[PDB]
Design a protein around this ligand. Sequence first.
Ligand code: C5P
Length: 388
Amino acid sequence: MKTITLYLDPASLPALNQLMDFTQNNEDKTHPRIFGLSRFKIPDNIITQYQNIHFVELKDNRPTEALFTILDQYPGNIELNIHLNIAHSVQLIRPILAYRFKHLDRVSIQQLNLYDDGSMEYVDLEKEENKDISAEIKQAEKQLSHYLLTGKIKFDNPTIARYVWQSAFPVKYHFLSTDYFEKAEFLQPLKEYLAENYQKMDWTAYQQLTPEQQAFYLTLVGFNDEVKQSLEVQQAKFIFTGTTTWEGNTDVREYYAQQQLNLLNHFTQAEGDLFIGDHYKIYFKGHPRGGEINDYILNNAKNITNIPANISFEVLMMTGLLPDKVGGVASSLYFSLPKEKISHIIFTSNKQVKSKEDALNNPYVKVMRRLGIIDESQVIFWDSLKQL
Ligand SMILES: Nc1ccn([C@@H]2O[C@H](COP(=O)(O)O)[C@@H](O)[C@H]2O)c(=O)n1
């Protein structure tokens, strides 16, 4: 039987891990590979190095039916080595289990590798507190059992269903926070249930790659040598997390850019409330949708290094190139940063957040403070920061 490897993810972190797995196996030029990574465009001059390499789009967290037309090209007994986003695993595997069910004679699942989307899985599991988690697991197993007949896609508990894959397939989970599963008491029946099928997400695989594969991976994730160069400076590094706009009582976007430079100055200037030290090299990490606001900040900030807004923090962590300190406007990205690297997280105004107390009740901030990742004093409501 032929193994076909499937790499599926609508988001970023699983994809970045799956592109790592491909890099690790990149000497194999003809292994059947199907890439459904919505956010990553593999360059042609990588693709043409390979054969039996295929691409499928995702629509609504599911590969399209063009997936079947690819799999049809492989008429043998085939087993599927599948890589998935955890939060979206059910929808992603839907069309795959359909192809399986439609060809039970010859198609089997070799194994699953599942990676956190991010803060989402953990914000989701918090909502499950006060449920009988043992009971929820068993029901979801029961429903999965009836489902690789497709007599199911009605999970009573969509969140817990993400974690019963072992009842049917060999699986490995890669968790952003194993500390959460081990320390959330309500999740003890799930922790124990999962036994040896989970591990902490590795951030170090890049370190064990060859320099050739390291360069390969940087190409896969669109991380050029000049940005890399900037981030290897033998000096303390601070990275400011930029944003778009908020409720500033104006729709003049330049005002939001200006304000963000004020926020930056609170880290970089001795007068600022959150001054990090004179010895820090300053970087700006713009929001991906920041647009011309990122252009404004760049053009009006002195002695800063821009890190292209399409470069994610997850890629900085995958590559071992995360700064000494991260600070600035709140984003879910902070949930996955090492505790010792978080300086101050600044929440701007919106419908939900109109104060520091509001910001301390942010769903990912709740997970964070529970895990001891941050202190309340690290959470700043933007209005308490004076005009410099
Ligand atoms: N400065 C920033 C702000 C957000 N981001 C990323 O962009 C995405 C959108 O962030 P928000 O949901 O906070 O608007 C997040 O997934 C986060 O990883 C970033 O890479 N740099």
